[PDB]
Amino acid sequence: KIIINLFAPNLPGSTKEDDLIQKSLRDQLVESIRNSIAYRNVFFVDGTRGAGKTTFINSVVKSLNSVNIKCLPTIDPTKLPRHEPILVTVTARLNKMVSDKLKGYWASNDYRKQKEQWQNHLAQLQRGLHLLTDKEYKPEYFSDALKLDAQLDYSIGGQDLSEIFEELVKRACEILDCKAILITFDDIDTQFDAGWDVLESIRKFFNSRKLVVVATGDLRLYSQLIRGKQYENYSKTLLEQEKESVRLAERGYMVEHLEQQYLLKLFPVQKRIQLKTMLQLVGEKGKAGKEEIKVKTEPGMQDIDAIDVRQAIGDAVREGLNLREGSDADMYVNELLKQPVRLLMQVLQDFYTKKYHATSLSVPNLLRNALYGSMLSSIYRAGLNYEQHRFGMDSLCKDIFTYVKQDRDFNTGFYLRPQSESEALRNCSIYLASQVSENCQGSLSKFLQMLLVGCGSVSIFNQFVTEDREKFEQLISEYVAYMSVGRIESASHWANRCCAVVANSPNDEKIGVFLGMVQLNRKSRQHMPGGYKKFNIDTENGLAKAAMASSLSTVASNNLMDFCSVFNLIGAIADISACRCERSAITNAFNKVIAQTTCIVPPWSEAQDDATEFSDAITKVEQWLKNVNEIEIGIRPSALLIGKVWSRFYFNLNNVADQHKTRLYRNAEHGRMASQSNAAKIMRFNVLAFLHAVLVEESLYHSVSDREYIGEGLRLNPVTSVDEFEKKIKIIGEKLKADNKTWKNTHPLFFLLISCPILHPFIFPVGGINCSVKALNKETSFNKLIDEIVGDKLLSDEEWDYLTKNQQIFQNTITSLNSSTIVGASYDKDTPAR
Amino acid sequence: AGLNYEQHRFGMDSLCKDIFTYVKQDRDFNTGFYLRPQSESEALRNCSIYLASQVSENCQGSLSKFLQMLLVGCGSVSIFNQFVTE
Numbered sequence: 001k002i003i004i005n006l007f008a009p010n011l012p013g014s015t016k017e018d019d020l021i022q023k024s025l026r027d028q029l030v031e032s033i034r035n036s037i038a039y040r041n042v043f044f045v046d047g048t049r050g051a052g053k054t055t056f057i058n059s060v061v062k063s064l065n066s067v068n069i070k071c072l073p074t075i076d077p078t079k080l081p082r083h084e085p086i087l088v089t090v091t092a093r094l095n096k097m098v099s100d101k102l103k104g105y106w107a108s109n110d111y112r113k114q115k116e117q118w119q120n121h122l123a124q125l126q127r128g129l130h131l132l133t134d135k136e137y138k139p140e141y142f143s144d145a146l147k148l149d150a151q152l153d154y155s156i157g158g159q160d161l162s163e164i165f166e167e168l169v170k171r172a173c174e175i176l177d178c179k180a181i182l183i184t185f186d187d188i189d190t191q192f193d194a195g196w197d198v199l200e201s202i203r204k205f206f207n208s209r210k211l212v213v214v215a216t217g218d219l220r221l222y223s224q225l226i227r228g229k230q231y232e233n234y235s236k237t238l239l240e241q242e243k244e245s246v247r248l249a250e251r252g253y254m255v256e257h258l259e260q261q262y263l264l265k266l267f268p269v270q271k272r273i274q275l276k277t278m279l280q281l282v283g284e285k286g287k288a289g290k291e292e293i294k295v296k297t298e299p300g301m302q303d304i305d306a307i308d309v310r311q312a313i314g315d316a317v318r319e320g321l322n323l324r325e326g327s328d329a330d331m332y333v334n335e336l337l338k339q340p341v342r343l344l345m346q347v348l349q350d351f352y353t354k355k356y357h358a359t360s361l362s363v364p365n366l367l368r369n370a371l372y373g374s375m376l377s378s379i380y381r382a383g384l385n386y387e388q389h390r391f392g393m394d395s396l397c398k399d400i401f402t403y404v405k406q407d408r409d410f411n412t413g414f415y416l417r418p419q420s421e422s423e424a425l426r427n428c429s430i431y432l433a434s435q436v437s438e439n440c441q442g443s444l445s446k447f448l449q450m451l452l453v454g455c456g457s458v459s460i461f462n463q464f465v466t467e468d469r470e471k472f473e474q475l476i477s478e479y480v481a482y483m484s485v486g487r488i489e490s491a492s493h494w495a496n497r498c499c500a501v502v503a504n505s506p507n508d509e510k511i512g513v514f515l516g517m518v519q520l521n522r523k524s525r526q527h528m529p530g531g532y533k534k535f536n537i538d539t540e541n542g543l544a545k546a547a548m549a550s551s552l553s554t555v556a557s558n559n560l561m562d563f564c565s566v567f568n569l570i571g572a573i574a575d576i577s578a579c580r581c582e583r584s585a586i587t588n589a590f591n592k593v594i595a596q597t598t599c600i601v602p603p604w605s606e607a608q609d610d611a612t613e614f615s616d617a618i619t620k621v622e623q624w625l626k627n628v629n630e631i632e633i634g635i636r637p638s639a640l641l642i643g644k645v646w647s648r649f650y651f652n653l654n655n656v657a658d659q660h661k662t663r664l665y666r667n668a669e670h671g672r673m674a675s676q677s678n679a680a681k682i683m684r685f686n687v688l689a690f691l692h693a694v695l696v697e698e699s700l701y702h703s704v705s706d707r708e709y710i711g712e713g714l715r716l717n718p719v720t721s722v723d724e725f726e727k728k729i730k731i732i733g734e735k736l737k738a739d740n741k742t743w744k745n746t747h748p749l750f751f752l753l754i755s756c757p758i759l760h761p762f763i764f765p766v767g768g769i770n771c772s773v774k775a776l777n778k779e780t781s782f783n784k785l786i787d788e789i790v791g792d793k794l795l796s797d798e799e800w801d802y803l804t805k806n807q808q809i810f811q812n813t814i815t816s817l818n819s820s821t822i823v824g825a826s827y828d829k830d831t832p833a834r
Numbered sequence: 835a836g837l838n839y840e841q842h843r844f845g846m847d848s849l850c851k852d853i854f855t856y857v858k859q860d861r862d863f864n865t866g867f868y869l870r871p872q873s874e875s876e877a878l879r880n881c882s883i884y885l886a887s888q889v890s891e892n893c894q895g896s897l898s899k900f901l902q903m904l905l906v907g908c909g910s911v912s913i914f915n916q917f918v919t920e
Contacts, residue, residue, distance in 0.1 A: 048840065220839070256877055277842040338842045421851060 047275030078191035279337035320367030378427030398486030455646035492571025512822035516653035518564035535820035543811030636703035652689035672771035684768030767818025
């Protein structure tokens with residue numbers, strides 16, 4: 001039953017008993033030390049850096065101070081003059097204890113008889129300081145020694161120091177009416193050059209049974225200290241005369257054997273004590289804890305109802321990372337509990353004080369500030385953005401991109417999972433998750449923009465750019481320049497170079513289908529039957545023109561190749577949610593790609609009034625903008641969810657790119673079956689793939705929801721049809737109706753994604769609808785549920801039957817895009833049907 | 835040898851990474867998962883029994899944990915040699 005108050009100063013020297021962590025390991029050692037002396041007598045307690053080692057020495061020394069063993073007060077070799085030997089401090093500190101007893105044992109016959117020995121011991125030990133502290137011994141001092149007496153019967157000749165200190169200690173103990181004395185050392189992590197003096201002195205003089213030693217630190221540090229001190233034991237010329245690789249290992253193995261026996265002899269294994277980390281004591285998610293540790297956020301709550309450590313770190317990190325409860329946050333706190341005492345204690349302390357002071361919300365804002373001050377080393381080592389005010393749209397995306405590059409796994413880098421082996425990756429991963437939970441809160445622009453630039457840039461880097469090891473870094477160096485990651489621009493502009501990276505590789509047979517991309521024909525092929533020709537640009541309606549303008553890409557090579565990509569639709573809608581006013585983003589964001597934004601060939605290559613009708617599209621968009629601006633305030637997404645959201649979108653577009661590659665046929669004139677694939681069908685399955693992917697796992701991982709709204713079953717991506725998606729609509733919809741749950745509070749994003757007027761015209765194409773005896777009826781049932789979700793009747797009665805059943809220009813559907821030829825295909829094959 | 839040493843980090847992922855790195859030093863992707871302390875180097879021999887005890891340490895009184903390290907601790911070493919090294 002440990003109650004931890006964070007408001008306390010919690011310094012190593014002032015922490016009381018109730019806030020102590022390790023007690024069962026403490027009293028176990030104290031009894032053993034008493035048992036050890038009751039009959040090389042050096043006890044070593046091992047813990048991670050800054051993990052209650054100082055509190056442990058004070059606790060054990062007080063228990064012995066409070067089997068009569070007198071323990072010397074704590075001494076820190078780093079807390080000493082640089083050139084001052086510790087053996088000087090030990091005698092000086094010990095002199096204080098012995099002289100204090102003589103002050104008590106004063107005014108008696110034995111008081112003179114005890115002091116006379118004491119003066120003898122210090123004098124004879126003083127002469128050994130000239131032996132050591134001298135920079136070079138002088139033969140004129142050979143008479144300083146050799147004046148040995150019959151007193152104390154010096155066994156070893158000359159001025160040997162090992163026996164003199166031992167004799168002083170034994171006489172000191174009997175004055176101190178104790179059978180033995182204890183020396184308490186401290187860590188040397190801060191100042192480490194004095195550790196070598198500590199190691200040599202311990203094995204030389206600290207061997208008497210009457211003297212017991214306890215030491216702290218980290219054994220990894222001692223390994224480096226001794227190994228370095230063993231290479232210097234070699235002659236200098238030998239190191240730079242025998243440079244052979246086999247010799248470098250043989251002599252290196254010599255010092256490893258030398259270092260191994262050094263630590264084992266100095267620190268025996270039995271007296272070694274391995275300290276307990278917090279997670280070993282708090283326990284696993286279900287395992288019983290050895291000791292019950294409880295923490296407090298505010299000093300006000302009772303010590304019996306204080307929230308548990310597992311509970312305290314759960315919700316705070318969850319809402320600080322904006323992720324649902326479950327095992328997803330369990331692995332996060334699994335990583336966190338592996339951090340040392342100081343970092344975890346500080347992060348809990350400052351975050352909770354910020355939470356209390358602010359409440360008297362933005363939980364990730366407090367966690368971001370709390371975690372920033374504790375993870376400085378790896379963040380500075382990770383090449384991150386360091387300025388406080390540069391927490392921006394583009395800097396964070398660039399930072400995560402390179403974080404993936406050091407991860408080197410281009411597939412799972414953007415999930416921001418803090419499960420990495422390397423410290424730099426693990427520390428940076430959790431911080432990146434904290435920041436994205438604050439830039440994406442209550443926002444749709446940052447939601448979509450980061451979802452595309454930070455999650456797919458690396459995937460296309462492997463897919464198109466990546467496909468001597470300096471090449472692994474020259475590909476890294478070139479991509480951050482050409483792609484212009486960290487170069488802030490419009491979201492559709494971010495996909496403009498992505499189009500060139502997509503279009504740099506011509507596919508087999510020059511088939512005009514790419515990764516969710518429309519490749520129009522501008523040339524005049526001779527002798528075309530059917531209804532395929534050049535697609536006009538000044539004969540359609542504004543609705544279709546507006547969507548096409550937001551669904552157009554331009555690349556200019558020796559053979560210019562106009563594009564009609566789908567990512568621009570995501571790009572165009574991204575900045576609209578940001579500006580949301582001034583009546584210019586609704587007009588200017590659409591048109592830079594068409595003519596103003598020209599993407600140059602990559603270096604690695606081998607190459608009624610005209611504008612009045614637009615008011616109708618504006619009016620419906622403005623009403624939707626009014627709706628979405630007041631709905632987007634309850635958004636708390638997660639990077640791991642968003643990373644999978646893009647990935648789910650990522651695999652979903654691959655089906656139409658591959659399967660529909662050979663699905664084009666000569667009789668695809670407003671084709672009715674899924675066997676054929678005209679120009680409209682490819683892009684129709686593009687938006688469906690995008691819209692189906694987001695809906696699948698939005699309920700599986702969410703901020704407001706608690707469970708899933710699909711339930712149990714199989715979830716896939718459309719390869720030929722949305723028949724599985726047609727089932728997903730009905731199951732969720734009935735659950736949304738059988739259980740009175742609203743659309744916006746469980747699926748806010750998808751509510752505003754499906755019902756946007758920008759994507760609406762292309763949802764019901766003239767030639768992309770699968771028409772059959774049963775398939776067309778399914779599409780009509782699909783249509784009714786689409787109109788139900790969006791609310792407003794997008795497509796009327798006549799303009800749905802006139803296209804599905806079997807000129808007329810309709811705003812909610814582009815009319816000539818199905819007849820728009822795709823160059824390089826020519827539709828030579830014929831349509832099979834069963 | 836270059837293994838894991840923190841008391842908290844000990845687990846299934848740490849052991850397989852330690853075992854995989856232990857195989858790398860001996861360059862024995864065939865009998866590496868046998869964890870035989872029979873290598874020419876003494877220190878590499880010394881680190882072999884260190885992992886051998888650990889493998890039999892947490893496997894005592896567990897069958898669910900036995901399956902998980904059979905898949906990774908014995909399969910990661912096998913497939914990497916056969917389908918990446920080859």
